[PDB]
Write a protein that binds this ligand. Structure first.
Ligand SMILES: CCCCCCCC/C=C\CCCCCCCC(=O)O[C@@H](COC(=O)CCCCCCCCCCCCCCC)COP(=O)([O-])OCC[N+](C)(C)C
Ligand SMILES: CCCCCCCC/C=C\CCCCCCCC(=O)O[C@@H](COC(=O)CCCCCCCCCCCCCCC)COP(=O)([O-])OCC[N+](C)(C)C
Ligand SMILES: CCCCCCCC/C=C\CCCCCCCC(=O)O[C@@H](COC(=O)CCCCCCCCCCCCCCC)COP(=O)([O-])OCC[N+](C)(C)C
Ligand SMILES: CCCCCCCC/C=C\CCCCCCCC(=O)O[C@@H](COC(=O)CCCCCCCCCCCCCCC)COP(=O)([O-])OCC[N+](C)(C)C
Ligand SMILES: Cc1ncc2[nH]c(=O)n(-c3cnc(Oc4cccc5c4C(C)(C)CO5)c(Cl)c3C)c2n1
Ligand SMILES: Cc1ncc2[nH]c(=O)n(-c3cnc(Oc4cccc5c4C(C)(C)CO5)c(Cl)c3C)c2n1
Ligand SMILES: Cc1ncc2[nH]c(=O)n(-c3cnc(Oc4cccc5c4C(C)(C)CO5)c(Cl)c3C)c2n1
Ligand SMILES: Cc1ncc2[nH]c(=O)n(-c3cnc(Oc4cccc5c4C(C)(C)CO5)c(Cl)c3C)c2n1
Ligand SMILES: [K+]
Ligand SMILES: [K+]
Ligand SMILES: [K+]
Ligand SMILES: [K+]
Ligand SMILES: [Zn+2]
Ligand SMILES: [Zn+2]
Ligand SMILES: [Zn+2]
Ligand SMILES: [Zn+2]
Lengths: 394, 394, 394, 394
């Protein structure tokens, strides 16, 4: 018997019996066997096996058996087709690459997004801005002191607050130190309170954000407690430890983890490393080629080993041409170094065009990834919540 | 009985009785009840309940009951599916986020776009260019005087019309004052005519565009009536009130409200504030980081507290590096300040690349919003009009 | 009777009789009338009216009657739906704006793209490169002489070919005149041959490309025949007529009309004038606003009418700020004028960001139009030809 | 008889007999013939011819016969429709151009991507990094020596390694020669081993990458063996042969052929030559026009043949204006030459805007091509492998 009619939700699909056996182990293959009447309930009169699934995609599911290739329809959402083919016992790895990228589009993004009686209350005072009426004030104070520290760090590098008076040297003002002292007092209090009243201290140390808070207060204490005699080494060590203050601006990442857009940016960066590598490689190759070409172009009609050749051109060598190539490919154009010869002008035009092309090739991939993640997150926060409202298991 | 066949427009959908009860309160749930024969007319012979709706989307509507997840088909317009699921008594908030953004795509844009016997005629003389044979001429005259005022305001800042003669000072020409006098006469006449013959004076004051028209004529009268003795304070107050003349260029917005593209731009700006905030935050973080990094890079191999370190570099400090970072991230490249050291060159390349990336991330969202709004508005004005031509209520 | 079943290609659509009358005058409305049995052939047994059209779109065509709104399906090409609704006697102007832009997508582009026994042979010698074995050589010669003329015109402006000897003056070389003489001889021969052996001389004059060929040879003859005495006016008229030689570079458009990409560019420009107007308006408003703001920003903390205020800033006035604003909004950055004050720096950052935003808003529309036209043209030339191969009228 | 019902997978399509004959030679045309009962098996009772294909696309396949135009549905993958219409014996060249570009979208990209007992082992030691435990080390050594050679070549052009001592001249250091000697020894060993133990020596010579490896070592041997007497010609030939060392940086392409992104880039370049030609033509026309216009604009109100006119402007001539136009159209803005007159400023603004427009027109085509190729390749490498798992021929 070849007439095996299948009633999927009302539509009476029909095909030959031999076709269903092309994929042994699947539900249709089991159905096609003669000893399947009891396994699947069917009406003997109509002689049709009934199912309660989506009839639209069953056509493609069966066409897999017919032609031997699996495709996902473009008129339905990917997850729906995934659920249907999971019900029908078909692996999703067999989908052809013509329609795999869009099929595996929402799930990958979803997964990427998904990536002592006072201890609880004390730990909940910090680490969560919106969890009580007091955590918000603590977060605001932390933000205020972080911004004050960043501002003071930026001011310390100015010439108005570093007057020259150890013959003359340059001595920084004092109030810039008192402000940082107050900020450091607050930060050390917060750090002690967090570290003492926290579980799994090892995870706390590994958080990679407490290290920043520790190293941002260490230099102040080292400076205050290491300002004694023995200037020969003390002055040098203090001068080279004053560079560690750059870690004060990294505490701002301890505060932006709550902002949604920056989480989306982090996910996008973590999901598009290959594109960054490709961009770097393209830029390196182009920079090398165009530096060499401009170096040779700016010397046509010149004595090879003549000092005069490298006198009327900014490209004294190839290594310095990397800077010019990088500036030209990005359409930046500082103007510190430009060609002064017609062949150099042609090379510069080629460099600018090729730079635009190379830069514009991978960037759209990262942009599309970011757009996907951002739309998904904003839609996810648009919907407040929803109960199952389905009472499954009929 | 489990055989509950549904005839939706001709297609005979079939499913188990238990499935329809998974969503109590919905039309299908009421139908599945035994006491529903009289509620919904059906042929006892065929034993099928008839409906007169779209059969294509009923498959998805029922698959919601089957699998427990709601999706909108991608082969039909969103509004059609919305109407169908409103007929079937299903809330649109249950649609999964995999297909919610496109489903809520046209309606949000449509809503955003949708955002004394002489009093009527006198008020209609103004406030509406295309409403009579005389309003057009009034609008043209207003445009002419507005452009004249803007041109005179721009000229007043030039050195040819501000010769030096109160020892020398700089005295502006007189014709530039006579022109503005004529323009102010016209503007005050128009303002009086509008304010006198208008309803709900409070709304008139709150319009936020009449305030501009008032403040753009106030300084002229203050100047003409405040040019007496007591120079010690009169000269200073006049000099600092001469800055208020910048409000003369804002009257051009009173005239561009009719242009469609600028209304679309206003809607796009009002609908994409989060993207602007995200762009600002990204730029701020990048600027801070790259300013710090360039400041430190331009000093490798230097004495920490040595005046010579900040002698052969444009980056005397971090605050001035914000300007360089902003210029470099935008591919602008004025050239007023550029790195002069290899590490500085690497930092500059990184800054340019990261700036391109960050700028290109959110901007496409705003661009897509603007494109949607513009296409919708231009299509809306392409169609002149159309009667219902449906005679509903069959 | 309400059971009016419609058999469209096999699918048995069913609906109430009253529904079909909602749109009087249409084919379905006529069918629903009791006196329609003879008009449309149907089987009395099945009691179903047969049609031989596409069943898929009939669902939407009937849903128009059901719900009262017309939509075009997104799983089929627009022209197919247009043909179907033309067969069903429904106007295409009733489609809702949610799906009108894509429906009217291919046809508009197609229409835009669609926009004496020796007289025939002589006229066919020119005006068509690929029409014989001799027209190609004539076109190549014309191209050669056009390029020679352009090169000579560009050289005439150089300082090497204009030595100073009417005391000194500057006298151009002679060979640059002999070359142009040869080119002009060829061009006048071609122009005479074209004008003499052509129909509808008025259309020839109106072609707008023969005027260029005439004005590009007129100055040479005027110069050669107007080099006599009376220098007082002859020298001046010759000097101001030497400017007309710029029309020699416009003959290149007489030759690029065959290239497909430039025809596509012309169509895109002719189809996107509103976007250019919008871009111009946006740029003008931004330039004005930012020029005013930078002018005022560069003077904070200054004496209003003090010559010293306009001494340490490039923005002596607002009009010169238009140039800076235009350069900054485009990310060009010549560097001839930049802010030197922190408020000026903030204004410049805002200007650059707003310029990027404004420029990026309408340009994508033009880009999409160009892509559509280019893809359509390249696909049209990919297909060589095809006979009807349908033998219609069955 | 006109009732010819077709049972395609369960759906009972019906149409007139005359319709099927509109396309003679096709399977449906043969079926419609009276002598086709035995050719195609069918049930005499149901009077319906059975098929085992996809019912969804059969509607469009038959609509081709109905209306006379062929379209591909947008709810299925192109290859599926291609297979179906190949089964139904319909040529794919008849598809209208409204839906041809997307139909021929995956296949073109797929095709483009698809574009002495020791001889085998010895040849497999090279030419394949991942084929053994020793080839990887050889590839790493080759990479190390290639990078060393490139670094030495770049250093040779510096002034620190070319001190001045044939009166003074400039003599390069010696260690830079010893390093290159070691690298050349390795490279010549590798080249000999490859050329000796390879088949079809002609293909080896034609590989176009062995020529680079040969010419990159030839100059070293020529220099070492051509440093004798007869300086008059020896010095000149050595100086002009020292330029051939630029071929040392091209060996890096012998190593990047394995990287996937660069193969994708090569395919994209090979598939988008017309777009590059179009970009070049657009840039040339714009450059010419804007150079002429700026040359004329910077001279309004000047004596035609006066030396003073070309004294206060950077545009001494039109040829030098090509450089300015190229720099301005790309938003690069070096600043070496800028307009200094209001008409020049207007021309510059127009040039910048038109340059942005022209550059942005074709580039998106190349970007889309690259995105398609990259996504296809990355998806192809995501899937490790898969057996047929279909056992065809039922
Ligand atoms: C992927 C790659 C992409 C590449 C894209 C780009 C590809 C670019 C491709 C090619 C560009 C080629 C440009 C070559 C320019 C040479 C000019 C020169 O050196 O002149 C000097 C050579 O002479 C001297 O320096 C001193 C005299 C020695 C004898 C010279 C004899 C002639 C040699 C000829 C050797 C030619 C062959 C050289 C080797 C090829 C000076 O010559 P002169 O006669 O002494 O003085 C003339 C003065 N006059 C002009 C005022 C009358
Ligand atoms: C997110 C973050 C991303 C970051 C990305 C980027 C990451 C970048 C990471 C790292 C970059 C590290 C660069 C370090 C360069 C130091 C150079 C220097 O100071 O030399 C001076 C130090 O000496 C003096 O100034 C005076 C003498 C004092 C004693 C010095 C002993 C050596 C100290 C060594 C301390 C090393 C450790 C310093 C602390 C690390 C001069 O030395 P000299 O011997 O007096 O003179 C040499 C002269 N000669 C060269 C001509 C022979
Ligand atoms: C869409 C729109 C977007 C807009 C976005 C941007 C929005 C931006 C919004 C606001 C920005 C506001 C900036 C104001 C800066 C004023 C500075 C100034 O003029 O100082 C001079 C005024 O004095 C003189 O010039 C001479 C003395 C006359 C008496 C002055 C008394 C104080 C007046 C105050 C009037 C204030 C109010 C002015 C009117 C507002 C000098 O003062 P001095 O005391 O003589 O000398 C001080 C010297 N010292 C500093 C070294 C000690
Ligand atoms: C696709 C294309 C896109 C194009 C877009 C752009 C399109 C742009 C379109 C048009 C722009 C047109 C600009 C014209 C400017 C001319 C200025 C000039 O030359 O003045 C000089 C002419 O005179 C001399 O040089 C010496 C005296 C000779 C007699 C002059 C008589 C007047 C001639 C008039 C001939 C006019 C017609 C010229 C031919 C058209 C000096 O004149 P003057 O009187 O000696 O001195 C005045 C001094 N004063 C001002 C201080 C009082
Ligand atoms: C270093 C030097 N010093 C004195 C020189 N004198 C002189 O004439 N040249 C020279 C310069 N470039 C040349 O070719 C060019 C031109 C443009 C780009 C380009 C090339 C390459 C080599 C193919 C690589 O990319 C040639 Cl062939 C020569 C002979 C000189 N080079
Ligand atoms: C202010 C100053 N004054 C004199 C100095 N002398 C000297 O050598 N440095 C110096 C400079 N940059 C350093 O590191 C770099 C390099 C590039 C970027 C970058 C860094 C950080 C600090 C990790 C942050 O981002 C180091 Cl480690 C040092 C020792 C000096 N800094
Ligand atoms: C012409 C002049 N000459 C001497 C001055 N001295 C001085 O202090 N100002 C000044 C400058 N800009 C001011 O405001 C700013 C700042 C930035 C941008 C901006 C504004 C506006 C006016 C709101 C418009 O856009 C103010 Cl309020 C003042 C008082 C002076 N202006
Ligand atoms: C070479 C020269 N030398 C002395 C001159 N003195 C003078 O006045 N001109 C001049 C300059 N440009 C003119 O027109 C312009 C303006 C801007 C752009 C543009 C044009 C064209 C010609 C239509 C082409 O594109 C005119 Cl009409 C004239 C009379 C002079 N030109
Ligand atoms: K740029
Ligand atoms: K730039
Ligand atoms: K620039
Ligand atoms: K610059
Ligand atoms: Zn979905
Ligand atoms: Zn719609
Ligand atoms: Zn189509
Ligand atoms: Zn497919």
């Amino acid at each position: 018997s070849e007439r095996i009619v299948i009633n999927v939700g009302g539509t009476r699909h029909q095909t030959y019996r031999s076709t269903l056996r092309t994929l042994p182990g699947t539900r249709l293959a089991w159905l096609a066997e003669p000893d399947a009447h009891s396994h699947f309930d069917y009406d003997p009169r109509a002689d049709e096996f009934f199912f309660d699934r989506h009839p639209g995609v069953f056509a493609h599911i069966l066409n897999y058996y017919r032609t031997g290739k699996l495709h996902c329809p473009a008129d339905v959402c990917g997850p729906l087709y995934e659920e249907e083919l999971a019900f029908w016992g078909i692996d999703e790895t067999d989908v052809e690459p013509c329609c795999w990228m869009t099929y595996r589009q929402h799930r990958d993004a979803e997964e990427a997004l998904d990536s002592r009686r006072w201890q609880p209350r004390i730990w909940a005072l910090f680490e969560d801005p919106y969890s009580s009426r007091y955590a918000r004030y603590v977060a605001f104070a932390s933000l205020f002191f972080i911004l004050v520290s960043i501002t003071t760090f930026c001011l310390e590098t100015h010439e108005r607050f570093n007057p020259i008076v150890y013959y003359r040297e340059a001595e920084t003002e004092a109030f810039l130190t008192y402000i940082e002292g107050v900020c450091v007092v607050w930060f050390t209090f917060e750090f002690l309170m967090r570290v003492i009243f926290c579980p799994n201290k090892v995870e706390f140390i590994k958080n990679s954000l407490n290290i920043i808070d520790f190293v941002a207060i260490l230099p102040f204490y080292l400076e205050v407690g290491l300002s004694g005699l023995s200037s020969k080494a003390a002055k040098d060590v203090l001068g080279f430890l004053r560079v560690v203050r750059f870690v004060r601006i990294l505490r701002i990442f301890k505060l932006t983890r709550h902002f949604v857009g920056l989480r989306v940016l982090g996910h996008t960066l973590r999901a598009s490393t290959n594109e960054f590598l490709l961009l770097i490689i393209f830029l390196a190759l182009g920079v090398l080629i165009f530096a060499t070409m401009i170096y040779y172009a700016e010397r046509i009609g010149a004595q090879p080993n003549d000092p005069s050749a490298s006198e009327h051109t900014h490209f004294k060598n190839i290594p310095i041409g990397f800077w010019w190539a990088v500036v030209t490919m990005t359409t930046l154009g500082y103007g510190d170094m430009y060609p002064q010869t017609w062949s150099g002008m042609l090379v510069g035009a080629l460099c600018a065009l090729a730079g635009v092309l190379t830069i514009a090739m991978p960037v759209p991939v990262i942009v599309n990834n970011f757009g996907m993640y951002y739309s998904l997150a904003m839609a996810k926060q648009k919907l407040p919540k929803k109960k199952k409202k389905h009472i499954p298991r009929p």
